[PDB]
């Protein structure tokens, strides 16, 4: 086995399923969770692995690149097809449930809205520390061929919801945007309550597109906080549907889709806590 085959084999076969009782009442130790996390290969793509002339100008970080097999390719309207974003599988490996991407840069804002248009995205989840360019308007802006207007904006302690319309030619679409702050990169939130409220907000969001599309989830680099959010959502789904969760397997599936998803042992430990809270909050 080549290093890469070893990596892919691990990511396809690792697992640590836990009954919800084990998760809530007898979880693995912090040391056990750290050792388990550190075993998971990054599956990072090297700049050499990527043969897309001109891509570097559209990456926030030279070391964080989209895996080619799952990268989102931009169509021709809006010369290249590149955006630093990957399709991410959801519950039970369901295809294209999410797109994980970096926060747009001024020169990739039109690319970002083209992705939203092309993929029929109706929901954007943005993870940040309010302490990256605003790619949405205060009232109305034009970005390439797209006009974006704010229809509604509501504030709660946990997040801000903006209701946006995107217009391309005579066609207008709705996009819900949720901005969740107080999550510093390479770290976790101080408590898990707000995060679960965010998951509920996402779960409660109606479909508004002509065909179901991916939920776009982003943060500065689009791997750490982005990976934690998606893993939390899939974990909640497992707990609700099956009364068990395989958090190791979730992280491994995420890393097959985009390298480096969930950055730190502390974030992996926080995922366990958040899912134990979700389990405790389940009806009945």
């Amino acid at each position: 086995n080549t290093p890469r085959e070893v990596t892919l084999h691990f990511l396809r076969t690792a697992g640590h399923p836990l009954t919800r009782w084990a998760l809530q009442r007898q979880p693995p130790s912090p040391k056990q969770l750290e050792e388990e996390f550190l075993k998971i290969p990054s599956n990072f793509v090297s700049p050499e692995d990527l043969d897309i002339p001109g891509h570097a100008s559209k990456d926030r970080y030279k070391d964080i690149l989209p895996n080619p097999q799952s990268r989102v390719c931009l169509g021709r309207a809006q010369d290249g097809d590149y955006i630093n974003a990957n399709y991410i599988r959801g519950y039970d490996g369901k295809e294209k449930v999410y797109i994980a991407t970096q926060g747009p840069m001024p020169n990739t804002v039109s690319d970002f809205w083209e992705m939203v248009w092309q993929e029929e995205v109706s929901l954007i989840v943005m993870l940040t520390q309010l302490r990256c360019v605003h790619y949405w308007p205060t009232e109305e802006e034009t970005y390439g061929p797209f006009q974006i207007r704010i229809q509604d904006m509501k504030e709660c302690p946990e997040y801000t919801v903006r209701q946006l319309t995107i217009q391309y030619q005579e066609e207008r679409r709705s996009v819900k945007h949720i901005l969740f702050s107080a999550w510093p990169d390479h770290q976790t939130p101080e408590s898990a309550g707000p995060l679960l409220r965010l998951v509920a907000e996402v779960e409660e969001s109606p479909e508004t597109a002509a065909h179901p599309g991916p939920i776009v989830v982003h943060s500065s680099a689009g791997i750490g906080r982005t990976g934690c959010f998606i893993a939390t959502r899939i974990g909640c789904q497992q707990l609700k549907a099956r009364g068990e969760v395989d958090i190791l397997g979730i992280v491994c599936q995420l890393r097959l889709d985009r390298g480096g998803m969930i950055q730190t042992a502390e974030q992996y430990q926080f995922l366990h806590h958040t899912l134990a809270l979700y389990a405790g909050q389940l009806p009945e």
Binding site: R60, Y61, D63, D185, I223, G260, Q263
Partner: peptide
């Protein structure tokens, strides 16, 4: 830029 570097993130890790």
């Amino acid at each position: 830029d570097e993130y890790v």
